[PDB]
Amino acid sequence: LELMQSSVDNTKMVSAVLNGMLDQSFRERANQKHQGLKLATTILQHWKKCDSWWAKDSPLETKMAVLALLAKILQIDSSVSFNTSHGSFPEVFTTYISLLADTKLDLHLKGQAVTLLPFFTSLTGGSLEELRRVLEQLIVAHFPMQSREFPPGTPRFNNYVDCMKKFLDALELSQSPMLLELMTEVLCREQQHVMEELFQSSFRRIARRGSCVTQVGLLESVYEMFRKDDPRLSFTRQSFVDRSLLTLLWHCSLDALREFFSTIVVDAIDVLKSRFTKLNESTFDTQITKKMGYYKILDVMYSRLPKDDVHAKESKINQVFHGSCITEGNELTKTLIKLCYDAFTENMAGENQLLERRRLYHCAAYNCAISVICCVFNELKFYQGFLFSEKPEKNLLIFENLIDLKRRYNFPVEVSTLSEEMSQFDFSTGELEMDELNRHECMAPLTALVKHMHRSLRDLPSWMKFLHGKLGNPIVPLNIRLFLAKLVINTEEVFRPYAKHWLSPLLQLAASENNGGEGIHYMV
């Protein structure tokens, strides 16, 4: 009290005395954790006496001393300076806003300000709307306009990584649904921001936290920001379900997740059961991308789930038909398998408007098909019925649509107690290889499917003899004829006992001068 009555006359010495009292109350916290919080309480109840620090026209050193002082004050105590109008929450939150608010510092002088969001992203949306408002103001006023465009080596991107890494640690330790809903928005604006790996590992660290009633909140937030009709472009609409919620879904969602599988299916099975109003491409490709996202989500949800709660009579299948009644069991797989077999079969002889994204849509339907056939009864010739067995009189082309058959493939030629006394100085200061064909977004489930066919139960008709018929003709397109051999290459342990029939077409691929270039070398 006497020390803070003299808050204007000698600010440097009272700041130094307060720091020297603060860390010494932090040092012996193992035996005297009663005064270390009472001191911070008593200084936070006296913030009225200091106002010449966190005001304008002061030179930009007292403000950073205020930042470090508040950082020590809030890193020492408990989470008590927010709740139920405890103390001077207006006149500490006004400081925390106004320090980062005005364009008075530089960009690496707000980096000390963006550290303490874990203590102050746990509020209610009254003032938290203003918090998100000033955060989004910083986003629209400080981040680059379009993309990176500055290498590390200019005095902007070194700063930019210096800020974004602190953002990513904030998002890592604070499971907050707002910061993810800003970082996802700033990520998906181009094809790749070059810092993807720490992004994915940080999303993985979000995915494993515990207290399992909040991961549904995170996935719900990114689902709602994906689903709504905010009229974005195609790439930004796809990139959410491509690489910001699927990272959370694949890594660690929940070992008994039925919530985000249950409350979603009658929101997108209708748009899967919808039509295509082919008059203008804007409503066209958005609906295609929504169907593609629903395909990939249903793919992962069928894949990393047990089969009993999805196939047997349980509390997860009573969702689509007539409420909570006993319909017949496992009907959702039937009404899904019908429309997915209807997909990847549409002939596009006249259809020449947007066909690459439709090819992606077909491949996504294929992946969903293999994922549900992973969960079917998987004994008799369902494997022979589905994913194969077309009828080309009525123009049923499985492979000749999903295979590109236009890209000229390149194929190159071949080539203890001192940890504590060291932290006290830190408290008070501060498979395969994918070249061109192995990433064809169909190969890994097909190879796992062939391997499962081996370790699950003449020729074998629909998956070996059918490919034998569709490889022996030198009148088939080239790219399918090259694509089909990198399945017996990668999974030869199934084709080795039936290699007595696989003797000619590999050498017909190698010998005839139709491979590409001077012959596609490393394939040869």
Binding site: K12, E61, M64, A65, H108, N158, N159, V161, D162, K165, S416, T417, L418, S419, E421, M422, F425, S428, T429, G430
Partner: protein
């Protein structure tokens, strides 16, 4: 940049304050914030610290906000000494000596931080155990450049050895105060003191201690003209007050033998009277207690006892010859205490007056009769004559010639 920051003082008097801010902002976000682990931007840190010191010479009115970046950088450069090449491990020494010259000539309200940078550096190097990690065997070159042969290192830069010496002694005593070196029972009825009761409860502190003692041993043989003169009472009293209730921990006798060898190198024993009675009251206790010990503890105890001055502690010369007929029989299979046995028997019998001595010769001398009883790159270089590559394998395979493992024939 850091050189021409000098003469730009007389042209703007604000750009000297603009540098050391732009410089520290460049210096932070290269090897403290991002890419601290995977980066190759390590081979310019001597130029960085040289620049910061050469601007800090001319910069008055320090900001006092970036000193926890300066003294979080210079301990990083002291840490990153052995991931280097020769003829740059001396440039790193010139950089660190330049910085420590810089932040010590302006004000004693500042230079308390020179006492915590070296304390943090000692806690850095005194905890380290494909890759290889250098344990403690090569920081000794830097820590001897920083103290001993320093007058050819602060010549080219515009005392400091006294200051860095006193800071090293304060750090090496301030570490050993808070370590918790007590040891607990591990999983018959034993008799000896080292037993299954040889298990320290703080095992990372023990490794710090056994890395600390050999480091202090190789750092303080000399340059002690008076630099170890006023420390002997405090340091000796601290070590006795520690190890009286710390019996079976070796190394305390090692540090005691270091300071008593320096107390014999300087004179200090022509009776100051306060340690003359502590040594006499401790020597009897170790000389009576060292019977029930074993090998690597006995070696430290005997090397302590047979180095007491004993041209002055002549009284009760019969109180140690059971620890001199032990230093020879425990020779012959571990040499450098069979060296200190003869080196003590030569110190006694020329200085102790020859009438208390002469009865005690038929029990010293009859135990002195166990003593009178391919292809490498060098070879392939030497087989093809002498053309400059034998000079390569003669110069690059040199300078590691300091291990004086005394053999038996000498």
């Amino acid at each position: 940049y850091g050189l021409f920051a000098g003469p730009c003082k007389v042209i703007n008097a604000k750009d000297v304050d603009f540098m050391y801010v732009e410089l520290i902002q460049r210096c932070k976000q290269m090897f403290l914030t991002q890419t601290d682990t995977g980066d190759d931007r390590v081979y310019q840190m001597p130029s960085f610290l040289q620049s910061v010191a050469s601007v800090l010479l001319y910069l008055d009115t320090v900001p006092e906000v970036y000193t926890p970046v300066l003294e979080h950088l210079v301990v990083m450069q002291i840490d990153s000494f052995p991931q280097y090449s020769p003829k740059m491990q001396l440039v790193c020494c010139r950089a660190i000596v330049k910085v420590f010259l810089a932040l010590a000539a302006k004000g004693p309200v500042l230079r308390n931080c020179i006492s915590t940078v070296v304390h943090q550096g000692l806690i850095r190097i005194c905890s380290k155990p494909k890759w290889k990690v250098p344990t403690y065997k090569d920081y000794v070159d830097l820590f001897r450049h920083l103290l001993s042969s320093d007058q050819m290192m602060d010549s080219i830069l515009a005392s400091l050895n006294h200051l860095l010496y006193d800071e090293f002694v304060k750090s090496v005593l301030k570490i050993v105060e808070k370590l918790d070196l007590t040891l607990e029972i591990q999983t018959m009825i034993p008799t000896s003191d080292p037993a299954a009761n040889l298990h320290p409860a703080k095992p990372k502190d023990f490794s710090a201690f056994i890395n600390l003692v050999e480091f202090c041993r190789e750092i303080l043989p000399e340059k002690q003209a008076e630099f170890f003169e006023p420390w002997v009472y405090s340091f000796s009293y601290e070590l006795i007050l520690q190890s009286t209730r710390l019996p079976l921990i070796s190394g305390f006798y090692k540090l005691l033998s270091i300071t008593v060898r320096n107390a014999k190198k300087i004179k200090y024993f022509e009776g100051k009277y306060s340690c003359f009675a502590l040594f006499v009251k401790f020597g009897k206790e170790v000389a009576v207690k060292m019977k029930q010990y074993k090998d690597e503890l006995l070696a430290s105890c005997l090397t302590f006892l047979l180095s007491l001055p004993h041209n002055i502690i002549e009284l009760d010369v019969r109180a140690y010859v059971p620890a001199l007929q032990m230093a020879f029989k425990l020779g012959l299979s571990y040499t450098p205490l069979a060296e200190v046995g003869l080196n003590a028997l030569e110190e006694w019998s020329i200085y102790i007056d020859r009438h208390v001595m002469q009865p005690y010769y038929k029990d010293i001398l009859p135990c002195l009769d166990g003593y009178l009883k391919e292809v490498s790159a060098l070879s392939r270089a030497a087989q093809k004559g002498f053309n400059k590559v034998v000079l390569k394998h003669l110069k690059k395979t040199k300078n590691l010639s300091s291990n004086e493992a005394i053999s038996l024939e000498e």
